[PDB]
Structure formats: structure tokens, C-alpha cells
Design a protein around this ligand. Structure first.
Ligand code: 2T4
Ligand code: 2T4
Ligand code: 2T4
Ligand code: 2T4
Lengths: 318, 318, 318, 319
């Protein structure tokens, strides 16, 4: 029995017995993602080169912004591309707050590296006029989150209370087909992912942990290394193959580099729903209470046994 | 003035004043690539999931094999998928020998990591009946080589005596548009790429070189690290951003891990034509004389200054 | 503010405050149409011709059948492709009955003539076991109807109580974009459409009417003639440009040739919702009470002034 | 063994042992057609409607063909419906071919999503002097190649040359024209007649009688069926595939017909003759008419031989 993102979303919405807003929000998001995917695969680039005789990041941001606003399901929108939280005009306001990164990893897009869209959805908790404050909720309050990976193929990973489901975009009919239901990450993996070019500035715990992956003190097989440089790609591989992903804090960056609202929380949410873990080293990413919409946060996530092991090393240096 | 792969190839062929065979071979390869790209982006996956009530690597291999045979321009075909060299039937034999990897990186495709097609084209040298021996030529004899990267977007990099040219596939019209003419790699980069999970087994020279990238002895800025795990993706980033890529021998791969005929030689050829370098440590990849179609070869390639620097360290440990 | 078929359908469904079934049915129908469109435009035909070394009407029928069944919104399905009404298995039954022609005009498909999908949706009006009898309702009971035209471009015309809306399929993202809201047909047109090859067998009223279009009584300019041979194409042109379409009953087809349940009623419903008319000559198509799911019905539809004029001629010969 | 437009064209070009220009011209035309098809199927129309918060199709199509042909370095004179005057390719991009074309035939009624197409005719410049409009004034008999692209239920490119007529289907998944019908030949006699009967009042007596014979066969055989899309490429293609006859004759108001000789009539007449069919103006074969104006009109009756011959019989009776 084939299932599509539209059908899946509509059914979960029916079960929730609500107003149908989140359904419309998700449908709009879905449409924006297919539009971003089309642009990422360079549809029509021939016209840009004169066959008939301006940035992907900005276009992606416009697509999400416009689709979400026109869904009438949102009131506050926080994007990695905008300095201030966007406030939806009164006549199009819904009860949801959305934090997102329209095109994650679009800084190296010149090498055709995988890129993606990350998003986190919250329910406005206060009756106050919508403001940036409404997006300052701990990831623990997420109602839904996920990402779209524009890699060899386009996939949308959607996480909610019912679990994590993966949909593959069929370009022939512009439909997201459900190919992986209630996904669970491997208990322990064999791959570690992080930019080792920062070795010199690594925190001692990170240095020792990576050293244990390369030189297992018990002489077991060393972990393999992978680092794409695009969070959505690295996190998705971690979910699919298991293992651990790190973008830790150091003396020069006490809070890390990745952003909490639209990068860390969404991925941490997907991880926990899949039976994985996501920590900053001091606490679970989802429990961090934000004070600034663009605040950074250190993050170590992936297979539970792997994160637990990291925390063990971290505790030793604490 | 727009230019397409078809137009470009046809023009270069006209200038060569030959039989037009290589033109037909390249046109056929081009068609196979677009077909592979369509399958990689999962066109029609909905039918596989029951919307109406073969493995990618095998399909890709079939596409290349069939298009090349039907081009009447080849006589011996070596592929990563087949144990023995395929010999084209007499009535479809041409004078070219093609070595290729239909879908490079298709092993970690579950995570939607970038994948690609690598190829190297040789002119049959010996006059004996076509056999596997015709594919045992040093990369120095290549007439043309390149790859197709199926990443955020699909691009075909084609290298010939005239240089390296990059074409972007416009999915809207199924046409490869020329977007980068006579490409040259940066003299020196700031990124090193290799699987550091093998640290324990690294040869001393590799260990020291990597150490110099992380802890510059001249206290300059440390290089950044990237490792996708897919050769076409890692090599393409190296070409575009500069830097160095390594897959040196391991103690469990005394002769390196990558294959000489359809992975190393093609990439080394593209690098040299772009002003870059490609060495095994002992000699230029292109000068190695193969004795077996699937033999492995160590490889260090990328920006000249970076490779030269590695060779300096290598020589110190020799 | 852009609007999509999905968004539109979901909103009208929310306002109806029902179970959401019709929403699920329409979404499923939408997905089936995009799949049919992809196959009609011949996606993948290259594989059929050996690039790598079922009939369209059957496939189309399977797509609609499977999507509708899996929607859990239907119970009785009538298709021009199946002699007997299909009864949905108990575990997938919904309250709707759907009559449709999977691929109208697929008989003359070899000439690439426009083809389409016609559908009519009824609410099961009985409390007993679903049977063919549930599809024998007069078009007057339709809850929704429309068609998909696979012409120069693909468009879905959907008619409901709120009116007629036209959606254009954007192939790049597989999304139906609303381009024409609350469409109304011209009061009077300048085009008449019917197969004049049947002149010899025409009913005197039809003969006189056509005669008035060619040799105008009020010395007005003669109407232009157009006859594609595909109902969806001819009817759509009528809706867009106005005028009249005819497929009357001659001497051997006293009951016409087109089918009442999945050709005539749906188009008649779209016409009336657009301010147009649809008559059999004796009564409004929508008022005919069917006794056989495949019974034929004569039909004259289009601009009101044009149909009224035909009826005037018809009455003179009655 | 699969074959594509590119492969086919490259092979025929190799056999001709020429400069390769026509190959580049055809490759360029092929690319332009795929781009036109993409636009006709409305790719990206969502952006036109604000999904992210514009020129006419006929104009775009004309630009695509013009630009691709110029950039092919194989042409010198280009005649299209869009520009009143023949376009002269700048010296640095001049080739030896002359191309007459209709970028988007039937785009006057593209609102109803009716089938549309691109028609083209290719000539070799037969003068040594400076390229001018005069080089496009050759009888269709001189055509080196001609054909059309039909943007209907699916997109197909029909290419006619000395070797015959070949039909290629565009596979949108890979942007490749796949050869699906080799050396096509039209049926000797068909059962369908096509023309705008709304002009009955102004029909020439011969046309009136001929149509009368199709509807009321004298020997009481089965009457012909009628089809009229209103788009020449669609009507002509159906004629080629199913056989029969297509007419757009001269009448009271239009003594020289309505269709254009250089980029509508000649190309279709050439495809018909190469397929074993016929194309007459009533007085002579369309291909033999010597044009004096690049946009001159010409009456046309084409299709299955037996059907055209029969028309000519009626025509001669009224002459
Ligand atoms: N389309 C979907 N909606 C919901 C999903 S999936 C999961 C969920 C949990 C709680 C309320 C919801 O919806 C609440 P409302 O927005 O309908 O009021 C939903
Ligand atoms: N389409 C292209 N052909 C050739 C290119 S690109 C580069 C090149 C070098 C030498 C001979 C060639 O052609 C040799 P032949 O195969 O035509 O005899 C070609
Ligand atoms: N998506 C749409 N639903 C409906 C539309 S459009 C128009 C309409 C009329 C009456 C009931 C409906 O819904 C009835 P139910 O199937 O939800 O119970 C709907
Ligand atoms: N691509 C094709 N070219 C030709 C084909 S198919 C058939 C033909 C006949 C005569 C000259 C030609 O071309 C001569 P030239 O243009 O190469 O000088 C061609």
C-alpha cells in the first residue's frame, strides 16, 4: 500500500482532531521543498546561460517564507537567512512558529556538495502579540521537525511524536513516497564525523574521544571517518548507518558553531525520536532554553552507545 | 553564446579531422549519464512502491555498456561491475577502449551520499584481436577522461588535450550546459581529504603530512578537513576549491584501495590537465603500467603546491 | 498569494467540517493524474526501446483504481475500462462512489492527440452493501467532478458547488498551480464542434442547427469549426473559448455514443457550474436517471446562448 | 539497438562526408525544441504565480530557435513568422544553410492547451554573393531537410530527408529523442478529411463537391470521418499517422490561401512526399511553387495519394 507525504500528513492530522492548520503548514512546506529541490538540481540553468539569447539561498528562503505565510498556519518565522524573526501579517496568522535553515550547506554549493533544508515547528505558547520571543522555546517543546536532503536523490525526513518517517521525492510525478517507516538509529555505529582540521583547538575530551575511535584501546576495529561539511548530509548518514556526529565547543567557541534554533534542535529531535541521542556535553540539546534566536550550541549526536561513550570521556575531563 | 556538451564535442571532433568515432562514443556516454542521473534521482520510484498496484549499480552498468557498444566506437570495455573485460561483438567494434566505474560510491547510497560515473578513454594500440590486454595502457595514453557527479546537481567534467571543461545538466531539457571553460585548479588549497579512521595503519609520511596540516609548523592557519567517502565528490571539491585528496596504501591495502584503471587514472588525468598533480608517492599515477585490469593503486592528488609538499615529506621517509 | 490543488482542496474540506474523506479522495486522484501525465508524456520510453539493452490506458486505469482504493474514501468504482463496477474491499471502504474514464481518447493516441481523465464523485446514498446500483445516480447528485487535460500542458479542471477552478501542472515540482479561479463560460461563442463526417445520419434538427452556424440567419459572421476527436480537448476548448460541442444521437445511435456516467455527466456538471448548459436534446444531461453504468447519452453542451439556440432548432423538429 | 536523434543525425552526417555543418544545425535545432517543449508543458509556471513571493510562448520559442541556429555557425539567412524581414546572420557566425521556420505554430490558440508545434525547412545557400532575403526564395523542391516538432500528448520530432521520414519521441526523463518509427510511409488511402468547414459559405466549388463526396459517398461506401484540431502540426501529423487528407484551400476572400508557403506549406509538403504522400495547391505541387515573398501565402491540400488525386480530379472538373 503506497503512501505519500500528503496522505501521511493528512491522516495524522485527522487523528489529532485539530483545526487542520499543521496539515496545511506541512503541505506548504512540502511544496516549498520540491521547489527548492528543482532549483538545486539546476532546472532552467540553460536560460541563465543564454539559450534564448539571484542566489539559491535567497530563493530557497523566499520559497519557504512565502509558502509558510500563505498557509495561514504560522505567526512567527525564524530563518538562518534573516537577522530578525519575521512576523506574519495579521490576516495570515496561524498558531505555529517555525524555525528553519532554507538551504543548509549552501556555502560550498559550488562543489555540488549535498545541501538541505532544516526545520523545527513549535506551537505559539502565549497569547501575546507574536514576536521573536515565541521562537525562544526549548527543543523539548517541538511538535514536529525534520529536514530535506538534496543529495543523490531528494528525501524528506519528518519526525513527530509517532516517530521518524522518510519520504523519497519521485521527480517524475513530484510526489514524496514513504520508503522508511518508524525509523530507528543503530544502537552503536562504526563511523565518526567531525572536522578534524580543528584538531589543534579541540577540547581535551574531544581529542581523547577521537583518539579512541582511531586507536581503540581494546584493539577492536577502528571507526571509519566521514565529514561532508553539510549538517543535513552528515546527520542523515548518521541516522541511516549509525555512529556519531560532532561539532563541539572549544575555548575559542564556548558554545559551538551550529545554531540551536534551526540546526541543532531539529536534528536532536529527529535523533531522540529515532532512539538516538543529542547532547551539548553538559545537557541534552532539547533541554537548552534559548535567549537569542541565532544563538549557537555545541552538539554531539548519533547512536546512543556512541554518544554515551563520548559523555563518559567528557565527564572524565570535567 | 551558450554551448552544450553535444556542440562542444562535435566541434572538437571536427577540428581533429578524424572518423568521428570518438564523437559518437562521447555522445553515447553523454546519453548514458543522463539516464543514470535520472535513475539516481529516483525517477519512477513510486511505481516500485505500488502507486499502480534492478539495482542502481547494475542498471548504470547496463546503460553505459549498451550505449558504448551501440556507438560502434569501442572494442574493449572494462567496468567496475564486471570481473572480466567485456569484448564488443565484431559487428559493433570501434577503435576505442573504455574503462569505467558506472556508479562510484553506490555502496553508501543508502545515505543518499553523492555518487558518480568515472571513465577513461584509450585508443586501441595493439592490432591483435581485442582482449583485456588492450585496457592495460598507462594513463599517459588517455585520449579523454572525466566523470559525472550526481550531487546537489549533476555535472559532467570532461578532460582532453584541450583542457578541462565542466557541464551542468539542466533537467528541464536534458541538456549539459557548459558553465566552466578550461578549468585550472588552484596552485595551493586549504583543505585536505582522506579517511582518518585509518590513522593507526598510516604510513609515517602520511602521518606526518596530515600532522603538518593540523599543526602547521610555521604556525599558519590549519587546513580544513572534508571527506565525503565518494571519490567523485571528494575529487570534484578538490578541483573546484583546491587542496589535496588522499587514499594511500594501508597495512591492509599495501597497494592502496582505489582502482587504477577506472578511478585513479581518470582523476589523475583530469588533475594534470587542470594544472594539478596525481602521484602514488613513488611515481605519477599516469605513468604506472598496469598488469591487471582491477589492480589497486595508492593516490595523492590536488593542487601542485600541496602534492609537492606531500612528496617532500614522503621523500624524507624514503 | 499562490494556491495549489492540495492547499485549495484541504481548505474547502476544512470549511465543510466533515470527516476529511473527500479531501483524501481528491488528493489521491491528484497523485494519480500526475502519474498518468508523466506516462502520457512518455517518461522512460527510452527503456522500452533498449537504452539499457502495459498499455497506457491499462496503466492509467490501475493508477486511478489503486490510488482511490488506498484513499479509504470510496466504496464503488466505475471505470470505462471494466465491464462491472469494482467494489472496494471492506477494510478500505469510504463513503464515495467514483465514475471515471482513465484515459479518454486513448484510442487515437498514436497521433499524439490530446487525451484526458474524466471523473465524477457521488456520495453513497444507501445503507446496504455497496453495489453497481450506487453508481446509478443522476448527475444532479454529483458532489464534485472534473477532468485532467493532457495537452500542450497538463491542466486539472475541478468543479464543485463553489464553482469551477483550473489548475496547471508544473512539471518541475509536480504541483498543480491554481491559475483560473471561479471560471465562467462565455455567454455566447463563435465555435461549433462535432464530427461532421456523420452528416448523412444527422437528425434534422442537428442538420439545421449546423446549417445556421455556416450560413447565419442574422447575416452574422459564420462560426469557426474545430473537432479534435478527444472529448476532454474539445470540451476544454469550449469552456475556455466558449461555443458549443455536439455528439448527438443519429439514426443508428439513438442514444448517442458518449457514456453518461464517466463522460457526459462530469462534463455537464463542469459546464453548469461554469454557467453553461448540457442537454441531451430532451432534457438536461444531469437529470437523466441511469439504469446501466455504461449506457450512452447524446450530448450538446457549451455557452448557454448557443445551447438554447440549438434547443430552439431541436424543438422546431419535435 | 536503441537510436537517438543525436546518434542518427551524426551518422547520416558522417555518410554525407561534408563539413559537419548540417549536423551542428540539427543538433542546435534539437536542443531548441527540447527547450520549447519544456516551456510549453509549463515548467516553472509556479514562479509566475508567486510561489516565491514572463515573455509570450511564441516570442520565447522564436528566440530559442533564432539563438540556437545563429550559434550553430551553420546558417546565414533565417526566415520566421515573427520577423517581417529575413534575419541575416552576422558574418562571424555564418554557415552555408538557410532556415525557414515557424517557432510555435498554432500559438494563437495556445490558451485552450491545443497541440502546438515547430515547423522548419532547411536549404543550402545557392548564391555566392552576400546573404539576403533572396536566398530563402527557393522552391521547396530544393529542400535538404525539413520536419516539425509536435507538442501534443507527448513531444515528437518528425525529420524528413532524402533517406525518408523518421519519427523521434522525446523522453522527458533524460531529455533524449528516441527513434520509434523508421522510414515512415503514409497509407495509400485514408478515411479522414480535415479542414475548417466553418468557411463552407466561401468554399471554391471543387472543395465543396469534394467534401460532399466524403460525407455522401456516390458509390454509397462508408463516409469519411472528420477531424480538425486547428493546429497545422497536429492535423498534419494525424494525417501522416492515420492517413487521409488535410485541406486549407484558397477561397473567395483568400485567393492564395492562408497558410504560409516558406515555413508552413513547403516543410509539410516535403515531409508528405518523402513519406509517399502528396501536397498540391490545386494547380501544382506545393514544392514546385517559386516564391517571390518570404511571407507569401499558398493554398494547400495534402495527405494520402489516392485522396489527394481524388481531390485533384474534382478540382480539374471545375477548371
Ligand atoms: N498534519 C498533522 N497535524 C498533526 C500532526 S500531523 C501530529 C499532530 C499532533 C498534535 C496536533 C496536530 O495537529 C493539530 P491542528 O493543527 O490540526 O490543530 C498534529
Ligand atoms: N568528439 C571528439 N573527437 C576528438 C576529440 S573530441 C579530441 C580528439 C583528439 C584526437 C582525435 C579525435 O577524434 C578522433 P576520431 O575518433 O574522430 O577518428 C578527437
Ligand atoms: N476536500 C473537500 N471536501 C469537500 C469539498 S472539497 C466540497 C464538500 C462538500 C461537502 C462535503 C465535503 O467534505 C465531506 P467529507 O468527506 O470530509 O466528510 C466537501
Ligand atoms: N547531419 C546531416 N548532414 C547531412 C545529412 S544528415 C544528409 C546530408 C546530405 C547532404 C549533405 C549533408 O550535410 C553536408 P555538411 O553540412 O556536413 O557540409 C547531409
Amino acid at each position: 500500500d503506497v503512501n505519500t507525504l500528503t496522505r501521511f500528513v493528512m491522516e495524522e492530522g485527522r487523528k489529532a482532531r485539530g483545526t487542520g492548520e499543521l496539515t496545511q503548514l506541512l503541505n506548504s512546506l512540502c511544496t516549498a521543498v520540491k521547489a527548492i529541490s528543482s532549483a538545486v538540481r539546476k532546472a532552467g540553468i540553460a536560460h541563465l546561460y543564454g539559450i534564448a539569447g539571484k542566489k539559491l539561498d535567497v530563493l530557497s528562503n523566499d520559497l519557504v517564507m512565502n509558502m509558510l505565510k500563505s498557509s495561514f498556519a504560522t505567526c512567527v518565522l525564524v530563518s538562518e537567512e534573516d537577522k530578525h524573526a519575521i512576523i506574519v501579517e495579521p490576516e495570515k496568522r496561524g498558531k505555529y512558529v517555525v524555525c528553519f535553515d532554507p538551504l543548509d550547506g549552501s556555502s560550498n554549493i559550488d562543489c555540488l556538495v549535498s545541501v538541505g533544508t532544516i526545520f523545527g515547528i513549535y506551537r505559539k505558547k502565549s497569547t501575546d502579540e507574536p514576536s521573536e520571543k515565541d521562537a525562544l522555546q526549548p527543543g523539548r517543546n517541538l511538535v514536529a521537525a525534520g529536514y530535506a536532503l538534496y543529495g543523490s536523490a531528494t528525501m524528506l525526513v519528518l519526525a513527530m511524536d509517532c516517530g521518524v518517517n522518510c519520504f523519497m521525492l519521485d521527480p517524475a510525478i513530484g510526489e514524496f513516497i514513504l520508503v522508511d517507516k518508524d525509523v530507528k538509529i543503530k544502537k552503536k555505529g562504526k563511523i565518526y564525523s567531525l572536522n578534524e582540521g580543528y584538531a589543534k583547538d579541540f577540547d581535551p575530551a574531544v581529542t581523547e574521544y577521537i583518539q579512541r575511535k582511531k586507536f581503540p584501546p581494546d584493539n577492536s576495529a577502528p571507526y571509519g571517518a566521514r565529514y561532508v561539511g553539510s549538517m543535513v548530509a552528515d546527520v542523515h548518514r548518521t541516522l541511516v548507518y549509525g555512529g556519531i556526529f560532532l561539532y563541539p565547543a572549544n575555548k575559542k567557541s564556548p558554545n559551538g558553531k551550529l545554531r540551536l534554533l534551526y540546526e541543532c534542535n531539529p536534528m536532536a529531535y529527529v535523533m531522540e525520536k529515532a532512539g538516538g541521542m543529542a547532547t551539548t556535553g553538559k545537557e541534552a540539546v532539547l533541554d537548552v532554553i534559548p535567549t537569542d534566536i541565532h544563538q549557537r550550541a555545541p552538539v554531539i549526536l548519533g547512536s546512543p552507545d556512541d554518544v554515551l561513550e563520548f559523555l563518559k570521556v567528557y565527564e572524565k575531563h570535567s
